[PDB]
Amino acid sequence: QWALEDFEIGRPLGKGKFGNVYLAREKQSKFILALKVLFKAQLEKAGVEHQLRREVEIQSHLRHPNILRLYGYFHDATRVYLILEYAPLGTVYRELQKLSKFDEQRTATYITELANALSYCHSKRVIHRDIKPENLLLGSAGELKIADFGWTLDYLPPEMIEGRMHDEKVDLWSLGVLCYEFLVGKPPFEANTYQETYKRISRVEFTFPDFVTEGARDLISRLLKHNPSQRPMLREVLEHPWITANSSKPS
């Protein structure tokens, strides 16, 4: 329903293998948005054309402040364009490599915004594949936003890498990995080798530094359970002592 002539393309916000994301303004309304270009030939070469298709379908039915809005899409069809919400303060990934670690208040707040978004998703029966700090954007007020459309093994659950079936408990594993990385600065199972990262995840083999406190250790230990059934619910995470005592955002 749209065209490339409807937008003024600004600076590249980020470069990727499948394409790039540029800052853009719709001419008729002066609306600042994010425009993500994707070459069709590359989507076919990897066969993710249908997965991208389904993920766009799922994303459209989602309306939440902690989830990056998807306005629309179109093609020429030399490339595929996605009309995205613009998040000014960039990714959590860069914020993480700028501050090395996150304090317990900033961490718990991010986890709360994530849990709320995921609780909204689980209510609409939509699950998330894997959550990366790279795919976590920040709004103008600094609010966290999910933007991978996902509906490196560093963030993949053990049941998902072992080939076993997976459910909604995947997202809670991701919260455990993210909460750790926020406090420590690196994923619990980070490594120089794929094959080795595989082992540390399957064994749930990780250790806590000295500065990470109890309650933080407690929540992460409960989220990073090998058996998915042992993992808590998002309602329980939001009511966790360590979260409620440091989170600046309500449920």
From Swiss-Prot:
Keyword Transferase carried by entry: yes
Annotated active site: D130 (proton acceptor)
EC numbers for this chain: 2.7.11.1
One Gene Ontology cellular component: cytosol
Activity regulation summary: Activation of CDK1, appears to be an upstream event of AURKA activation. Phosphatase inhibitor-2 (PPP1R2) and TPX2 act also as activators. Inactivated by the G2 checkpoint. Inhibited by GADD45A and p53/TP53, and through dephosphorylation by protein phosphatase type 1 (PP1). MLN8054 is also a potent and selective inhibitor. Activated during the early phase of cilia disassembly in the presence of CIMAP3. Inhibited by the small molecule inhibitor VX-680.
GO biological process: anterior/posterior axis specification; apoptotic process; cell division; centrosome localization; cilium disassembly; G2/M transition of mitotic cell cycle; liver regeneration; mitotic cell cycle
Cross-linked sites for Glycyl lysine isopeptide (Lys-Gly) (interchain with G-Cter in SUMO2): K132
Outcome following mutation: R79A: Reduces ubiquitination and proteasomal degradation
Impact reported for K36R: Loss of kinase activity
Effect of V48M: In a metastatic melanoma sample; somatic mutation; constitutively enhanced kinase activity
Factors inducing expression: Expression is cell-cycle regulated, low in G1/S, accumulates during G2/M, and decreases rapidly after.
Outcome after substituting F206A: Decreases the interaction with phosphatase type 1 isoforms
Post-translational modification: Phosphorylation at Ser-202 decreases the kinase activity.
DNA-binding among keywords: no
Enzyme class: transferase
GO MF annotations, alphabetized: ATP binding; histone H3S10 kinase activity; molecular function activator activity; protein heterodimerization activity; protein kinase activity; protein kinase binding; protein serine kinase activity; protein serine/threonine kinase activity
Limits of the Protein kinase domain: 7-243
Location relative to the cell: Cytoplasm, Cytoskeleton, Microtubule organizing center, Centrosome; Cytoplasm, Cytoskeleton, Spindle pole; Cytoplasm, Cytoskeleton, Microtubule organizing center, Centrosome, Centriole; Cell projection, Neuron projection
Keywords, comma-separated and alphabetical: ATP-binding, Cell cycle, Cell division, Cell membrane, Cell projection, Cilium, Cilium biogenesis/degradation, Cytoplasm, Cytoskeleton, Isopeptide bond, Kinase, Membrane, Microtubule, Mitosis, Nucleotide-binding, Phosphoprotein, Proto-oncogene, Serine/threonine-protein kinase, Transferase, Ubl conjugation
Reaction it catalyzes: L-seryl-[protein] + ATP = O-phospho-L-seryl-[protein] + ADP + H(+); L-threonyl-[protein] + ATP = O-phospho-L-threonyl-[protein] + ADP + H(+)
The family this protein is said to belong to: Belongs to the protein kinase superfamily. Ser/Thr protein kinase family. Aurora subfamily.
Further comment: Centrosome amplification can occur when the cycles are uncoupled, and this amplification is associated with cancer and with an increase in the levels of chromosomal instability.
Known partners and oligomeric status: Part of a complex composed of NEDD9, AURKA and CTTN; within the complex NEDD9 acts as a scaffold protein and is required for complex formation. Identified in a complex with AUNIP and NIN. Interacts with FBXL7. Interacts with CPEB1, JTB, TACC1, TPX2, PPP2CA, as well as with the protein phosphatase type 1 (PP1) isoforms PPP1CA, PPP1CB and PPP1CC. Also interacts with its substrates ARHGEF2, BORA, KIF2A, PARD3, and p53/TP53. Interaction with BORA promotes phosphorylation of PLK1. Interacts with CIMAP3. Interacts with GADD45A, competing with its oligomerization.
Protein name: Aurora kinase A
Name of the encoding gene: AURKA
